[PDB]
Design a protein around this ligand. Structure first.
Ligand SMILES: [Cl-]
Ligand SMILES: [Cl-]
Ligand SMILES: [Cl-]
Ligand SMILES: [Cl-]
Ligand SMILES: [Zn+2]
Ligand SMILES: [Zn+2]
Ligand SMILES: [Zn+2]
Ligand SMILES: [Zn+2]
Lengths: 206, 206, 206, 206
């Protein structure tokens, strides 16, 4: 674990996240668990201007290194890490389809077998609270108790995994599931779903 | 403030606007406040052929330099500048989702907290008037009185900010909000929204 | 008018058409009026393998040069040229949104002022007939009598103008109008439209 | 037929499949009939890291070469080859629009004349069974009896042809048909379709 290799990967994740079309508009933030705190993207610097030197470190007490301002949404990354001790990377964005489903304040049900990737038969939707607020942190910490990803009402998506690319994958996969959901929901409501049992089998094979 | 640095930035904005997919089809126009008038993109020259020498200057009386024809939609950029004395850059386009919402002649309500970026709890929709017409100018001037962005009925979007990239961001952000609106509107009407008060809090934190 | 400059432009149009996302899937065909016949893209050669030598010439009697097979849809390009003597370039594709509207067998009404670009207050939809059939030719010739573009039922789009880039623009603009149509149609039917008179004014300013 | 030329083409297909936007999210798998077995993409290696050496060979008894793990979905490629003895390439993905239609568990009817490309007047939808399961193999083998492509319920798409690019084309064409279907279905249900007879004519001209 070297501070700079981790910093390079974070910028690469931010770039790749723009490449898949998850980033752009409000823009997300990425972080990796590090030492006692975490390394997180800074607030207000477009991925283009980013460099290893812009990545900020927040320790265990929420104290960030002097002269650097972490993401304005840094509080819930810590809630992510505290809630899922197995997570080493948190990716947060305001991707279009995820955000739209959270505007309807709905969980995404087992419409496709890959939903097992988040750890169960659903992608939850955490209740609304002002961004960067402590109450929002509880909402998300509670949602990630049993799921690796959650939607944030009238907000976006937050997904975590053991490393950055698996976290990016998950986040990207949740956009896909969100889009399949919106698309079929506009034709039939409720949308057909796989039973909990089939999901159990898939979870088994995963 | 150097005429040519500003001209280069305008072409870059036009290029970037095509990159985000806002431009193309009818095509937009960009301008920056300058001296007593403004520097605006010329009518009928695809971003590709553009150069610093094509950027036209219109003074305070609406007089443009000889041999150059400004954008056919130059009149409402002036209405933008006159209405918002704090705006130094106006970006206008006919982006797909913004235009679709203006076809329904609806304002975009507080469906996501970022709507506070336009200065309030909504993105208005100005009434229709022929393009390049003076009546259209009033409609837009009235809409931008209290908002940094407005939709134009059966037309498109017009957004302004203190500089070009913030204006481009806003314009891009309004497309996102427009798309979240259409998507959820096709499933439920009315779409859930944040109360004016929550918006007030966000405006506070912004 | 040099056979090879025209051939290079056609391949460029085919490439650009793929770039805007109009081409791909079934794939389109482009042609330019030439001498007594026309120069048209050949059947079954992906834009990538294309070269000036693949562009085929069909004379006035429908006879093509030996050893080269023109587009399987060459018959209606001739109907385009015969119907609109002012057209020097025909672009045909099976773009997604245009094709979807033609599946509903609906004309696109005056939902946006740019519809005047096709020459009136609507984009018609020609009746169905097997592709490469002579009856299909009449359907399209009749539709282009008074419009520069037309949709083909359960088929796609065909647009013409005085040169290739204006034809490409139009075709691209019709996809935009098609998409605005589908999007608002899924929320309200009928979709609000500009009166014939407003269109008349726009036609005047165009 | 050289093992390595085939391996290079498979990686190129995987890359191109990402380029059209079919791949990404769950990710697909490609294979080519080879000797007594087939050459298939390996499980868990992003197209970027892929190389000729990662392509795995499974013989006729389902035995794969030591030290290499084939795609977790290799069983139904064999069902593809056994069902369609004329197929030499199978492309499988979880493309967005195909998957959404299979979530509704609907076949795609003759909404556009190109549907004849799959061999008839429809694109079927095979019933659900756990991935990599033998029962899923029967479902797909039965569906491909008379069609070159089939959708897999709550899963994705599987298309085959005589070679890789024709298989890629078909797969891409099915996404298009899937999208035209969803789009018009959200406005009218049932969506207008061409009669079996018209399809017969097209099949004739194909
Ligand atoms: Cl549970
Ligand atoms: Cl107000
Ligand atoms: Cl008329
Ligand atoms: Cl049959
Ligand atoms: Zn956020
Ligand atoms: Zn305009
Ligand atoms: Zn065609
Ligand atoms: Zn699969």
């Amino acid at each position: 674990m070297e501070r700079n290799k981790l910093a390079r990967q974070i910028i690469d994740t931010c770039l790749e996240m723009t490449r898949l079309g998850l980033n752009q508009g409000t823009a997300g933030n990425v972080s990796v668990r590090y030492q006692d705190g975490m390394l997180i993207t800074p607030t207000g610097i477009p991925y283009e201007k980013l460099t290893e030197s812009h990545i900020v470190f927040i320790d265990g007490n929420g104290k960030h290194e002097e002269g650097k301002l972490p993401s304005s949404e840094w509080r819930f990354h810590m809630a992510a890490y505290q809630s899922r001790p197995d997570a080493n990377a948190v990716v947060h964005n305001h991707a279009v389809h995820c955000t739209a489903v959270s505007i309807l304040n709905r969980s995404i049900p087992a419409i496709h077998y890959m939903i097992a990737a988040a750890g169960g038969n659903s992608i939850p939707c955490a209740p609304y609270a002002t961004f960067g607020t402590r109450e929002l942190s509880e909402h998300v910490a509670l949602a990630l108790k049993n799921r690796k990803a959650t939607l944030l009402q009238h907000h976006g998506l937050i997904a975590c995994e053991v490393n950055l690319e698996k976290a990016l994958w998950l986040a990207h996969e949740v956009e896909v599931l969100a889009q399949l959901y919106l698309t079929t929901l506009a034709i039939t409501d409720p949308v057909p779903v796989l039973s909990d049992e089939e999901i159990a089998v898939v979870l088994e094979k995963f």
